[PDB]
Design an enzyme around this catalytic site. Structure first.
Site, PDB file in Angstrom:
ATOM      1  N   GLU A 117       0.837  -1.197   0.000  1.00 52.90           N
ATOM      2  CA  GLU A 117       0.000   0.000   0.000  1.00 52.90           C
ATOM      3  C   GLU A 117       0.865   1.236   0.000  1.00 52.90           C
ATOM      4  O   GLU A 117       0.610   2.206  -0.725  1.00 52.90           O
ATOM      5  CB  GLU A 117      -0.872   0.021   1.261  1.00 52.90           C
ATOM      6  CG  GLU A 117      -2.090  -0.863   1.201  1.00 52.90           C
ATOM      7  CD  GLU A 117      -3.107  -0.485   0.150  1.00 52.90           C
ATOM      8  OE1 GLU A 117      -4.031  -1.299  -0.004  1.00 52.90           O
ATOM      9  OE2 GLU A 117      -3.028   0.568  -0.502  1.00 52.90           O
ATOM     10  N   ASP A 133     -15.535  -5.445   8.887  1.00 55.88           N
ATOM     11  CA  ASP A 133     -16.592  -5.481   7.878  1.00 55.88           C
ATOM     12  C   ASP A 133     -16.594  -6.790   7.098  1.00 55.88           C
ATOM     13  O   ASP A 133     -15.583  -7.490   7.019  1.00 55.88           O
ATOM     14  CB  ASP A 133     -16.408  -4.328   6.894  1.00 55.88           C
ATOM     15  CG  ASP A 133     -17.362  -3.181   7.164  1.00 55.88           C
ATOM     16  OD1 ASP A 133     -17.789  -3.063   8.330  1.00 55.88           O
ATOM     17  OD2 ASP A 133     -17.656  -2.432   6.210  1.00 55.88           O
ATOM     18  N   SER A 144     -12.221  11.061  -2.434  1.00 53.39           N
ATOM     19  CA  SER A 144     -11.604  10.519  -1.231  1.00 53.39           C
ATOM     20  C   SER A 144     -10.090  10.528  -1.383  1.00 53.39           C
ATOM     21  O   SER A 144      -9.564  10.733  -2.476  1.00 53.39           O
ATOM     22  CB  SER A 144     -12.096   9.100  -0.977  1.00 53.39           C
ATOM     23  OG  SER A 144     -11.480   8.210  -1.879  1.00 53.39           O
ATOM     24  N   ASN A 204      -8.951   4.722   3.616  1.00 52.13           N
ATOM     25  CA  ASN A 204      -9.730   5.635   2.783  1.00 52.13           C
ATOM     26  C   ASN A 204     -10.638   6.563   3.571  1.00 52.13           C
ATOM     27  O   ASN A 204     -11.252   6.219   4.602  1.00 52.13           O
ATOM     28  CB  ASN A 204     -10.516   4.761   1.780  1.00 52.13           C
ATOM     29  CG  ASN A 204     -11.168   5.686   0.777  1.00 52.13           C
ATOM     30  OD1 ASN A 204     -12.361   5.978   0.785  1.00 52.13           O
ATOM     31  ND2 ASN A 204     -10.392   6.144  -0.189  1.00 52.13           N
ATOM     32  N   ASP A 261     -12.525  10.062  -6.974  1.00 51.14           N
ATOM     33  CA  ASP A 261     -13.848  10.008  -6.355  1.00 51.14           C
ATOM     34  C   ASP A 261     -13.951  11.003  -5.208  1.00 51.14           C
ATOM     35  O   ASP A 261     -14.989  11.039  -4.529  1.00 51.14           O
ATOM     36  CB  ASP A 261     -14.231   8.583  -5.921  1.00 51.14           C
ATOM     37  CG  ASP A 261     -13.484   8.061  -4.701  1.00 51.14           C
ATOM     38  OD1 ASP A 261     -12.602   8.758  -4.181  1.00 51.14           O
ATOM     39  OD2 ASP A 261     -13.838   6.917  -4.301  1.00 51.14           O
ATOM     40  N   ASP A 272      -6.616   8.230   0.306  1.00 47.63           N
ATOM     41  CA  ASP A 272      -6.078   7.144   1.101  1.00 47.63           C
ATOM     42  C   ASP A 272      -4.896   7.677   1.901  1.00 47.63           C
ATOM     43  O   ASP A 272      -4.008   8.334   1.335  1.00 47.63           O
ATOM     44  CB  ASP A 272      -5.652   5.959   0.241  1.00 47.63           C
ATOM     45  CG  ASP A 272      -6.854   5.349  -0.472  1.00 47.63           C
ATOM     46  OD1 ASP A 272      -6.839   5.406  -1.708  1.00 47.63           O
ATOM     47  OD2 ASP A 272      -7.780   4.852   0.188  1.00 47.63           O
ATOM     48  N   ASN A 292      -7.867  10.204  -4.821  1.00 44.82           N
ATOM     49  CA  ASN A 292      -8.658   9.484  -5.782  1.00 44.82           C
ATOM     50  C   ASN A 292      -9.583  10.530  -6.420  1.00 44.82           C
ATOM     51  O   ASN A 292      -9.903  11.607  -5.903  1.00 44.82           O
ATOM     52  CB  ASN A 292      -9.346   8.311  -5.110  1.00 44.82           C
ATOM     53  CG  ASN A 292      -8.365   7.575  -4.191  1.00 44.82           C
ATOM     54  OD1 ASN A 292      -8.539   7.504  -2.968  1.00 44.82           O
ATOM     55  ND2 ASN A 292      -7.335   7.046  -4.825  1.00 44.82           N
TER      56      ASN A 292
HETATM   57 CL   LIG Z   1     -12.721   1.320   2.412  1.00 44.56          CL
HETATM   58 NA    NA Z   2      -7.199   2.313   0.720  1.00 45.24          NA
END
Ligand SMILES: [Cl-]
Ligand code: NA
Ligand SMILES: [Cl-]
Ligand SMILES: [Cl-]
Ligand SMILES: [Cl-]
Length: 129
Positions: free
Chosen positions: A35, A101, A50, A59, A48, A52, A46
């Site tokens: 990562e 999750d 967001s 995120n 979108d 990271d 990103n």
């Molecule tokens: Cl996520």
């Molecule tokens: Na991420």
């Protein structure tokens, strides 16, 4: 800060990640390696809206508050700034929530692309843990 591989493994172990939610320690070291290249300040934007953040590239849509992301849920209840700290504590605390999750570690793009199904124990080779 750029962690050493076994340096990071030891800290992750101290914080209880070994086997957490079914992921042995090497999965977490591998996720950080791919990562962020072990860089606590890694930050990737990103399209979108967001971002990271940090060594585990967490995120900002669901997990931290940066004040600028659509659909913000801030489920770890932290400023995304905390996830850029040189110690890993906030990132590991939040990662434990993320992995809980139904996604598990599939939340991490780099884990899905470079760690899932591999010999993840190799990432803790020679760490004496
Ligand atoms: Cl996520
Ligand atoms: Na991420
Ligand atoms: Cl620590
Ligand atoms: Cl392992
Ligand atoms: Cl922030």
């Amino acid at each position: 800060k750029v962690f050493g591989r076994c340096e990071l493994a030891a800290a992750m172990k101290r914080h209880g990640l070994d086997n957490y939610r079914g992921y042995s320690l090497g999965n977490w070291v591998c996720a950080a390696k791919f990562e962020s290249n072990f860089n606590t300040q890694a930050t990737n934007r990103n399209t979108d809206g967001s971002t990271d953040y940090g060594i585990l590239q967490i995120n900002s849509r669901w997990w931290c508050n940066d004040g600028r992301t659509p659909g913000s849920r801030n489920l770890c209840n932290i400023p995304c700034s905390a996830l850029l700290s040189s110690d890993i504590t906030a990132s590991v605390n939040c990662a434990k929530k993320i992995v809980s999750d139904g996604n598990g570690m599939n939340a991490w793009v780099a884990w899905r692309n470079r760690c899932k199904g591999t010999d993840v124990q190799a990432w803790i080779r020679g760490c004496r843990l």
